[PDB]
């Protein structure tokens, strides 16, 4: 489903370029654009083809979500949910209240919604995740170092893959993997299968595991010692 436009001279647009009806294709503007689409200059066939498609902006991942959260106007949404609180239906008042609790928590705290998306991931000081030589010179280390190394390898491979313009499928795989690596660093096993070291079924111990439970930092080292 494309629209053909033959030319008799130099064309002004190259393959890949995106075009709206009314755009100058070729022949000094003699051939124009009828339909929305994508330019394929066929030199063999001497025609400027235009495959019908919009320049739509639809993203995936935390980048998309981070945009939408940056765009939220909190006061506006609060006004709308207050209007919603005047509804007859009890369930719609319930939903508006639950949303407005979050809205006004961000409003009164001074936090920004988009801060729930990470750009810079913090790195714990190395003495809290040590690499120590035990008696005998052999080495022992925290699981967190392996969780961080996974994250760093996946990020660095993503930066390289972006530099070589890899096809989208490859970047999408890498980005899904980066999200899961951050997720395993922060709360391993929360979403999906837990990350384990090779040759062991034991889940690596993440930052969430360190705080929680009878063995966590709170009950084990702060409420008793």
């Amino acid at each position: 489903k494309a629209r053909v436009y033959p030319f008799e001279d130099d064309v002004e647009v190259s393959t890949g370029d995106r075009v709206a009806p009314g755009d100058v294709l070729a022949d000094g503007g003699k051939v124009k654009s009828d339909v929305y689409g994508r330019v394929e200059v066929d030199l063999v066939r001497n025609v400027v083809r235009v495959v019908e498609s919009y320049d739509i902006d639809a993203r995936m991942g935390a980048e998309a979500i981070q945009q939408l959260l940056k765009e939220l106007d909190l006061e506006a949404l609060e006004k709308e949910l207050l209007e919603e609180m005047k509804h007859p239906s009890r369930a719609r008042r319930a939903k508006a209240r639950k949303r407005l609790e979050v809205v006004r928590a961000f409003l009164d705290s001074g936090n920004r919604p988009e801060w729930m998306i990470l750009e810079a991931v913090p790195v714990l000081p190395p003495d809290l995740r040590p690499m120590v030589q035990v008696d005998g010179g052999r080495f022992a280390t925290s699981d967190l170092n392996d969780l961080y190394r996974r994250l760093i390898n996946r990020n660095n491979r993503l930066k390289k893959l972006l530099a070589q313009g890899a096809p989208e499928i490859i970047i999408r795989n890498e980005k899904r993997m980066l999200q899961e690596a951050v997720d395993a660093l922060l709360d391993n096993g929360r979403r999906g299968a837990p990350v384990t070291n090779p040759g062991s079924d034991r889940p690596l111990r993440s930052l969430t595991d360190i705080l929680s439970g009878k063995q966590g930092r709170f009950r084990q080292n702060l409420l008793g010692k």
Partner: protein, 346 residues
């Protein structure tokens, strides 16, 4: 839910190349690279800069980042400027721009069409320290290298050439990433050769080999001590969160004492020492106490030379040496008299 099920689906979306489509895309890639070279000859720009601008337009502004080799930050502004400098060329020159754009589009399509071959190779390198998906991605890097280096004139199929770079990239990844304490690639090769040698020897010996038998089998240059030192260098760390016993009661880390921070006993011994040294030093004159303190570093942490303490007290280096020596003589006389610093000597 299952990320490799998702990725296998996404890959099953793109259909497999016929010989004709294969050759066509490879040809388009080769010719687009030649066109970038010709555009560099014409415009006097940088072939890398041109390749990046053509790529920026083929891919879209969705993916438009900076490149580490480029001397100029690749910003939409600069890619538009370069695209306009290009679009202003005569028809017979601007022909090469369409060539290059066609080449980049073919390149993307050729990679995407051969994503399945990476998976079929990488499923065989599991259990070696890298996740399946991690192997797939490193193999994908190998496949990209292959696409850029392929020559369709040779009439070899693409799969043949791509398997070599894919294996290259998977194995490189395994040897660069598998270990927590990173070991250079050549040393990993030696370690793995040592492993295979040991395994062959056990299979012929019906038990594990000694260091010496391993040394024999590794040939000249290898004695038992070198085998042992290599095995020592190869040891991977163990987890601090390793369970000790059946419950989740305790972990290996629980039993590791901090050897770095001074114990309360050591700190108090150092403090009693400082105080006893100050006490014994007050039995000297201000100058001999001060000369000793400057010369031992008890003041500013460092020990000054005789010339510096002398220039400070306005006196010869020989003079300062002589007053250091009488200060020591006095300290020793008092210490033999009272035995008040002896026990600190261990």
């Amino acid at each position: 839910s299952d990320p490799v099920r998702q990725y296998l689906h996404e890959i099953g979306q793109v259909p497999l190349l016929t010989l004709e489509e294969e050759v066509e895309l490879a040809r388009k890639v080769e010719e687009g690279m030649e066109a970038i070279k010709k555009l560099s000859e014409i415009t006097g720009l940088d072939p890398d800069l041109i390749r990046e601008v053509v790529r920026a337009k083929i891919l879209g502004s969705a993916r438009v980042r900076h490149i580490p080799g480029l001397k100029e930050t690749l910003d939409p502004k600069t890619v538009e400027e370069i695209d306009q400098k290009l679009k202003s060329l005569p028809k017979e020159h601007k022909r090469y721009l369409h060539i290059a754009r066609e080449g980049e589009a073919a390149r993307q399509h050729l990679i995407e069409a051969n994503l399945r071959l990476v998976v079929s190779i990488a499923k065989k390198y599991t259990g070696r320290g890298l996740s399946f998906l991690d192997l797939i991605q490193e193999g994908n890097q190998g496949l990209i290298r292959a696409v850029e280096k392929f020559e369709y004139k040779r009439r070899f199929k693409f799969s043949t050439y791509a398997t070599w770079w894919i294996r290259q990239a998977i194995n490189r990844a395994i040897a660069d990433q598998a270990r927590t304490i990173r070991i250079p690639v050549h040393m990993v090769e030696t370690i793995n050769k040592l492993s295979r040698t040991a395994r062959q020897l056990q299979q012929e010996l019906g038990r594990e080999p000694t260091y010496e038998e391993i040394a024999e089998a590794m040939g000249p240059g290898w004695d038992a001590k070198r085998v042992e030192e290599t095995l020592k260098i190869a040891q991977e760390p163990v987890s601090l969160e390793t369970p000790i016993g059946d419950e989740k009661d305790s972990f290996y880390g629980d039993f590791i004492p901090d050897e770095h921070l001074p114990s309360p006993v050591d700190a108090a011994t150092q403090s009693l020492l400082s105080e006893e040294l100050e006490k014994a030093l007050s039995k000297l004159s201000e100058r001999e106490a001060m000369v000793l303190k400057l010369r031992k570093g008890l003041i500013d942490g460092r020990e000054h030379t005789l010339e510096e303490v002398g220039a400070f007290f306005g006196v010869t280096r020989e003079r300062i040496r002589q007053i250091e020596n009488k200060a020591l003589r006095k300290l020793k006389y008092h210490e033999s008299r009272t035995r008040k610093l002896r026990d600190f000597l261990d």
